[PDB]
Design a protein around this ligand. Structure first.
Ligand code: 81E
Ligand code: 81E
Lengths: 276, 276
């Protein structure tokens, strides 16, 4: 609930936010990219001291447990799934995972497969040998889907399901299908109290993680998959997909679905989860 | 004498300095450029509240007074000419000028002519109607030379002289004549106590000011000009130049000439100044 410190005048955050405010998206992006390129990398998860650590956000008797993956945004983190987890308090366990590289002097993944890999392992630590559902908002969805598929292919472990909260793509290829530019504006122009500053490490991590979306290795997971679509933004999956993929609509936008319209989203997730 | 705070881990300074340490010059440069592009600009000196303000570094009876122009470096500023001015203490007045845009929420010049212009005006405030010599170390030299010429052409005011301390070029065109990359390393790897952090405003200002070197409008000044060359780095000007230009050698490198070998440099400046 407590606000992080406001951005200073000379801060990267402010310069960044001012650039978005004044519609200078490409320039802001190029700064991020140039900054992100200086960050040090890691190629294997063994080169990591410890794996990112999960935050428990709700506890409960059970069903499958919910493991949420943070969005690769500079203001992202475990706190992003707290309202959502509030609707599950006392019913089931809900964790969230930070992404590696957003905390100062964490190295970033060197490659998209390493990125998927670290999310997958850290998802496993969080499962603690239980049966789990991977959740991911927006592009965290893409990392959740693909981490499910990596778990299946290389460790023969299988989530009960994967939930995508308005995930718009996997690779997020910049190609006119969606205003990616306007979505970035809207995200960072959302008006709420964040518990984190957009540090230089978090902004450079965002660039690196977002930059890897375009080069992700696409891989199928057989486990069931729920896409909750947000109706305020506005028959592709059947028997021929090779696995069940359901699409539910929610009366919410992309942002409101994990915020004020979160309890709807949670309930659509509950309904679906037990109908499995 | 007191050290500025050390760079934090997440600071632009550290990431920047680490990039230079590990020989990743182009990448460091690209970050600087991308950052510098977000800074706001100004096209006229009238759009400025106040002009940069001079710091008096030595006082004295007189001769021509010495006005030093700071180097467009992130750790630059009036303090750069303090050792030099120490050798002139009690003999003549020595000021230094900050460059606009290095202090947080100063705007940068929009164009190289504005850059020259602001240096020229701020040089004038510092002259206080007296007779003066413009001094400039390295690339500050280029701005000093050209500001002399702007003073001459548009206000008919004429420095007594211009002194260039190992200035290597005017436009500093990246073109194999000199290791610009290795000179940037060496500058920032110099080991001394700075009284300033390389803030984000100072690093973005450096990019913008350095970036404008390549597009400067070259213009002659008629006033006499001394180039002190540094011998540890290792007949072009005569009657056909159209004005007197002298080249003296000093037993010093590019950095040592304003540091430990400063009193030599000062004395070469004294000798020359009175032989006019
Ligand atoms: C150099 C990289 C560059 C890195 C950097 O320049 C861009 C950073 C963009 C950050 C966008 C943040 C948006 C967050 C809002 C969130 C809802 O969208 C998202 O969660 C996903 C977001 O819309 C998609 C981002 C993909 C990047 O836009 C792809 C790319 O340009 C590919 C390029 O190869 O990233
Ligand atoms: C995008 C710009 C870029 C801006 C940014 O990418 C470069 C910053 C470079 C900073 C260098 C600092 C060196 C300081 C040492 C000092 C002794 O050298 C100097 O006082 C002068 C220094 O060697 C010359 C710098 C000229 C720039 O190197 C020219 C340029 O690449 C032209 C290009 O159009 O600057």
């Amino acid at each position: 609930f407590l606000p992080a410190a406001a951005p200073e005048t000379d801060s990267l955050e402010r310069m960044f936010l001012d650039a978005l405010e004044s519609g200078r998206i490409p320039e802001a992006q190029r700064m991020l990219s140039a900054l992100g390129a200086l960050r040090p990398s890691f190629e294997n998860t063994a080169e990591l001291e410890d794996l990112p650590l999960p935050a428990t956000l709700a506890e409960g008797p059970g069903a499958p447990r919910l493991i949420c993956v943070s969005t690769p945004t500079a203001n992202g983190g475990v706190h992003e799934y707290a309202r959502l987890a509030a609707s599950f308090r006392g019913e089931r366990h809900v964790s969230a995972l930070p992404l590696v590289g957003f905390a100062a002097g964490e190295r970033l993944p060197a490659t998209p497969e390493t990125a998927v890999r670290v999310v997958a392992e850290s998802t496993l630590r969080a499962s603690d040998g239980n049966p789990f559902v991977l959740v991911g908002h927006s592009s965290a969805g893409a990392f959740a889907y693909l981490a499910a598929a990596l778990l299946e292919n290389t460790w023969g472990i299988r989530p009960e399901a994967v939930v995508l909260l308005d995930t718009l793509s996997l690779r997020h290829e910049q190609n006119e299908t969606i205003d990616y530019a306007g979505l970035m504006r809207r995200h960072f122009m959302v008006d709420e109290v964040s518990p984190v500053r957009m540090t230089n490490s978090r902004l450079s991590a965002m660039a690196r993680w977002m930059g890897m979306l375009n080069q992700l290795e696409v891989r199928h997971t057989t486990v069931p998959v729920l896409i909750i679509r947000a109706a305020k933004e506005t028959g592709i999956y059947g028997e021929d997909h090779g696995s069940p993929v359901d699409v539910r609509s929610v009366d919410a936008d992309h942002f409101s679905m994990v915020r004020d319209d979160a309890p709807e989203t949670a309930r659509i997730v509950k309904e679906w989860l037990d109908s499995l």
